Amino acid sequence: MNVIAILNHMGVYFKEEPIRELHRALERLNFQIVYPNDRDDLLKLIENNARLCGVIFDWDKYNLELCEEISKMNENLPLYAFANTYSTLDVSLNDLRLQISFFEYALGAAEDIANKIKQTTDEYINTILPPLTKALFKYVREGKYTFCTPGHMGGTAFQKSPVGSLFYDFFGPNTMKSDISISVSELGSLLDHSGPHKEAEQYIARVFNADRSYMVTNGTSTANKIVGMYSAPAGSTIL
Amino acid sequence: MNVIAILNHMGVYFKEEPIRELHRALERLNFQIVYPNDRDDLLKLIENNARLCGVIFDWDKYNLELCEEISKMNENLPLYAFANTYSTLDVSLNDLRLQISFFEYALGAAEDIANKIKQTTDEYINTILPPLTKALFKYVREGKYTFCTPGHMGGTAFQKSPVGSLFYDFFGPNTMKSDISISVSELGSLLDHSGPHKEAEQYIARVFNADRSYMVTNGTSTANKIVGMYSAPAGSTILIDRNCHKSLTHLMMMSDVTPIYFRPTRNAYGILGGIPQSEFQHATIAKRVKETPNATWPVHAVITNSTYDGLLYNTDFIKKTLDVKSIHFDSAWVPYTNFSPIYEGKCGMSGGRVEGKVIYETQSTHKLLAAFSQASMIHVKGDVNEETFNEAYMMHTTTSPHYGIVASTETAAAMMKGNAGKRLINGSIERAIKFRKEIKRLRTESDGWFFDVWQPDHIDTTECWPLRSDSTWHGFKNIDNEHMYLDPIKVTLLTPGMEKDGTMSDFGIPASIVAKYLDEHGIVVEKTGPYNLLFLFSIGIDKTKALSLLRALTDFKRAFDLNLRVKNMLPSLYREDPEFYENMRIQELAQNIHKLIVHHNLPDLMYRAFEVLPTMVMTPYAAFQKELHGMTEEVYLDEMVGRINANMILPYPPGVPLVMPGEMITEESRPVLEFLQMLCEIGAHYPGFETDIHGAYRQADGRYTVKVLKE
Amino acid sequence: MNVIAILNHMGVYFKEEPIRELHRALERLNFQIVYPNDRDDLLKLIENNARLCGVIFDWDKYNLELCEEISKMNENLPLYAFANTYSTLDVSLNDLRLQISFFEYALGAAEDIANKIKQTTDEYINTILPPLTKALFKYVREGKYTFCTPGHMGGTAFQKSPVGSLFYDFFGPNTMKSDISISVSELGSLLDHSGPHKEAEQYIARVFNADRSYMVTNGTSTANKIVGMYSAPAGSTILIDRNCHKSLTHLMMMSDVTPIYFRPTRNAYGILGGIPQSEFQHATIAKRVKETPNATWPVHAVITNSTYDGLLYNTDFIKKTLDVKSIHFDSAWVPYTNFSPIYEGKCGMSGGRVEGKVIYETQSTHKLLAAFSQASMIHVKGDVNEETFNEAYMMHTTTSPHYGIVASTETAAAMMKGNAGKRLINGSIERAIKFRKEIKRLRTESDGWFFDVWQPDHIDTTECWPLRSDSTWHGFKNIDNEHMYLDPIKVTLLTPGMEKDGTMSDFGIPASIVAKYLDEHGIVVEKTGPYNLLFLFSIGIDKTKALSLLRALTDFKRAFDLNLRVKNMLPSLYREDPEFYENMRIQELAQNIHKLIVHHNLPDLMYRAFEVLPTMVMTPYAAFQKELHGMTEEVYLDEMVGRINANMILPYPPGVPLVMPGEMITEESRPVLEFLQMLCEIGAHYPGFETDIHGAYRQADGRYTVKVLKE
Ligand SMILES: *Cc1c(COP(=O)(O)O)cnc(C)c1O
Ligand SMILES: *Cc1c(COP(=O)(O)O)cnc(C)c1O
Ligand SMILES: *Cc1c(COP(=O)(O)O)cnc(C)c1O
């Protein structure tokens, strides 16, 4: 997730020069820059490419041809449209879910714009991800809780055995660090149904239209036997 | 400041080759080179980009299309125009302030041209900056004076402590070196009023049209106490306005004076109007003198122009009818009524010197300008004693002023002179009027309810809209004509909830709910409460911050029409009480609060609690003296009829004082006490909307207690 | 803060290879790598270099030589010690605050180690900083709030004007972004005393040993007015010291109180001592009450501890003999009498809570510490009312404080906490005692006259030298034992010119000539005049600024013994009058001024003028009321016997008040007027050394005029 789109070329210099200054500032924080062509070019960069999170275009050029087609696909994609002096909204742009970030064409302030894009991108990551997954990714980058199960502890024992180094370098460092048990306080437990695990049951049942949705960790073949041991008395009758 | 512009391309080689040689010479001295396109390209590099100082163009190509448009934006802007053999000036280029530097197209002399541009740029910096700020910047680069105050001495002690290195590296090396005191000879002292500080006081008064002006380093709240302690002896009489600030109340509590409160006008939405013209008469002021025990002739008058909302007065009528030798205008919200033709004769500085009188103003600096906090001014228009007024200024200013704020106080005045400063006031007005038209355009075309702007039906003109007597938008009963004006930059948004006659309605959304939604995206509401919203459109609000407010208003209608949840809209309000705000939606909360306003009747109790002034027993100065002795007690809110309060009641909403410290609530001020008991019931059922009254302490049962004086 | 230290070299390859791999990984996250030599090399990288936060060393090599010396300086300093297989702790390493992070020498895992160092470094930053400063740094990096105050909003308006870009590019981007008001929820408000501002009052009072410490944002001159406006009702009685500051005089002119002036001790050199122990008795205070009309029992006492020269008193005797429920200590020059064992029982905060009394102190911040200007504190030691004292603090502090100074006020209290902060107090004392020994060493070994330090004959000890009764260095006649102390960091250089008995000599150089000579190299004398030179040896004076002062003193003896010209020695004085100072040398100017002091008799006319007290007719508050009406006139200096003055006379030298506003010069105070007429004659012959008296206006003939009240 580091693709920034810069659509259209006004042909002037006071608008393209800030783009050239921003081109060298976004690459310092690991971000790919793409230059789409016409309106149909930007539409192909959203359905096909899924690692996009930034769309830069002139607000006084396509204010109704881009704010409608993008909202039908991704209703939370951060838009980095650049407005002008005589810029305004439209009456047909009220019932659309968008995230437009306005800016200007000022020289020297390209460094401050790069910090706002990185902060806005972090807000999009924290929104599309559930709170249970957010706690797992944050524990890897921020988490030094030792003396906890499992025994590998993010792949510590694999760095001592020669055969264990081949199994740790196959998946990745972030793979073994995300394999933790219920030995963490800020993540709760699955059997306790509290904390992040409590909000996960309400987030799945609401989207899938249900009242109480669980998470079976042994496939469907095991989940069928859980229901069968609830409404089947001894010597009764099942269909 | 290192941007050099090279406009156009002649196509020839004897003119473009010196440009290529100069391109490699200017980069050696840290200068950015830009290549604009046509004539409209260079015009966009001045209004948007402010770090530009060099314009290179052919003189025999655009000698009239560039020398006129640039002169309308900046006067001292250097113009590095290249002339030819058959080149001359124009008759239409005599009354224009420009700085044209001629050169040639000689090869090999590109190094000598770069030295001339660097010196010209240095002369531009030493000219547009005031001598006080210029001497401060030169002292940092050239200044090795030791054994001086403060103790940090440019950040010397911070390099020895491990924790001090994090605080020094945050601001910068040039930040701590500029924080010096009066231990410098070539910069003078602020209390001495000599040297660079003497020329700075005469420069600020010339920009803001005044005779003498000081630099208060403790905000406007302190500047109001310096003037009040100059024309109000012990046992005199002052004419302070009712809509006073928290600092203005302390002025009455620190001086043994007998104030006379006025009766400003107001409507039903809570918008503070103004003082009628009948209160400024001679028979009206003299009538309240005999009725008030221990009161002589008023020798000072305090007028809050403008108020907290943003409604100017008419100084052309006050300076002639009001017979007060010391008239004060608390200009804590209009530090710009000078550099615009639609603001002539609206403030105290606009006009001439009034004989036998004097005008005082406390223009705020860190409010609607661009400077550090705790900065104010004292504008004096008249003939006052210099040896007497100087002693009153030292009673509120320390002997070691912070030059980091003093340099910014004068900088805000230097940013206003010239065409580059006039476009900041007019630029904010054009962006404000444009935002006013975007609301009326998205109101009729929309399908449903929409926000409204407290403005007349005709806003095509570009001036202050007068509050006439044949209009229905202001809603003021019996208002004086040509006395109350409207501030264009002070856009007052009205939320649907009330009618045009002052009653209520079935469908309505309070302004307190919208204020919480704006804080989520990052919008701070200045004033909120019943059905009104206030925003600040100063010179710092550019086109990005202005358009960000309209998008947040359109998103509130979408989330309300679709009936969303509180958790999926207001995450900050959900964290206050997740149990109560669980199964509650955005339409259930907006309708339950609206029914409480109609049931408790807010517009009627608020309008009748501010007009009837409570009986003032003693002076506000005597109320604070009894508190220091220890004769104070805490009683309940329902048990206080006939007692003398100790503090000032500042209920939110709105934001005006209710009972002054020293008054008594008798049988005449009955609706005054009913306003306090009404807010305690409406602000106790739903979390997040608690009652906010400065003076009422919350206990453990819900009943608020106030501090009164013992009998 | 990005210095990582790697000590020693094992010589093996399995330990040095991970060091080289980590060298290429730490540089990717901006970190400086250093390689010290032996054990003494690492110790020099902590005291001198404060930007260090990482020490890498072998655990099985120096487990006891490094874990003890480092803990004595910085306790929270992270230690990246690398252990081995057979590694263990020590019994002598239990009572030491350390942060040891164990690692291995695994290849390829250098990337994971770099992430742990960056996370550990972030923990050190989020620990040594107070929560109020932590919220300010996080708001700059993370903050998207629009429509806030002030109008600049981190420098938005400065990017639109050409003159505004020069003021924004000087400080830095992070400077203007940290200047926000009380419009932020996650930072609280200063007037509300909640959130981060609530924990800041408990963090400063705990370190400085207090119960309620506030943050004044207008210097010490304003904090003294808040204390006086709390325990001094109208028509009461206060015990203010005679050697009061300019702000302390205005406190008496703003409150209708009856002050009682003391009679501190003094010598002939101009160094004022302190209040004797006989003035604190019950028979002395009650005697002046009956003699002074309209005066009751004193309820507040203002004690200047220490004075302007730096002389500590004895609080162990005042808190028991002085029967005042509100004893104030003006600690504007000793913000460190707590972090050293040689300062116990010398201030009001040292010790416990006095039964029935309260201690109020206004310790300065931008005087002898490291913070922005206009910063002070209010220390409360006792059981007082919180709701009553809160109203007095809001009468001098604006509603929109400057967080750039508030963050620096609490930072000064955090830079002194811990052993890393205590080394700055003890380090400044060791550098001060060393400077005192260098003067006596260069005095006897030299050939001729040399400067002298006002210190006892025995300075081998490291403590405050008491002023005994059997000594001749202090010169105070009839002084109380164990009452007056000496500040070691307050070195007073006594220039030759007077004897040890109080009379005059034949060969000497006044201190006024030396004061201007030090300014040529960049040294400003704090206090000069007769034959004294006061300096400040705070934490800002490092080993470079201390040694530079002695070198400038040795150059004055060389230029005076060789008899040089004024033009080739004092170029600043020569530019004032090149015609008069043409054929004049350094010996002719030094001998002519010395004869004028003996002729006019300065020590006798100064010791007798400041000793007696003029007849106080009315209170200082009533003197300012008559000035506002306009009954003030300007009379000559020779025509004022029997009149009432309006301003305070502050003659230079020395720098202490002479006549308070509201007193009368009759037949008893005859030497008082003789001191003013003597300075008008000695300061008129030679330019540059003119008479400097705050209150006397210079005319066109030479005679100074003062402002008195009309009869
Ligand atoms: C495939 C299948 C299963 C097994 O699914 P798993 O998730 O692998 O356990 C169970 N029931 C039915 C009807 C299936 O088709
Ligand atoms: C905001 C305001 C003040 C306080 O301004 P500061 O400069 O922060 O002291 C004082 N008076 C009025 C009328 C105000 O609106
Ligand atoms: C220097 C001084 C002051 C003034 O200090 P500021 O912080 O600049 O206001 C006040 N009182 C005393 C005793 C001083 O020495």
Numbering used by the authors:
A (entry chain B): 1 to 239
B (entry chain E), C (entry chain H): 1 to 711
Task: Show passages lifted from the paper.
AAA+ ATPases of the MoxR family are ubiquitous and found in all major phyla of bacteria and archaea. They are proposed to fulfil chaperone-like functions assisting the maturation or assembly of metabolic protein complexes, and are often found in an operon upstream of a gene encoding a von Willebrand factor A (VWA) domain-containing protein. The most well-characterised representative of the MoxR family is the E. coli ATPase RavA, encoded by the ravAviaA operon, together with the VWA domain-containing protein ViaA.
Building further upon these results, we now present a higher resolution cryo-EM structure of the LdcI–RavA cage in the presence of ADP, obtained without symmetry imposition. We show that the complex is built by five RavA hexamers arranged into spirals, with a prominent gap (or “seam”) between two LdcI-binding RavA monomers facing either the top or the bottom LdcI decamer. Indeed, these LARA domains (numbered 1, 3) undergo massive rotations when compared to the crystal structure, whereas the LARA domains of the RavA monomers involved in lateral RavA interactions only show minor movements. This results in a seam that always faces either towards the upper (orientation A: “seam up”) or lower (orientation B: “seam down”) LdcI decamer, and never towards adjacent RavA hexamers.
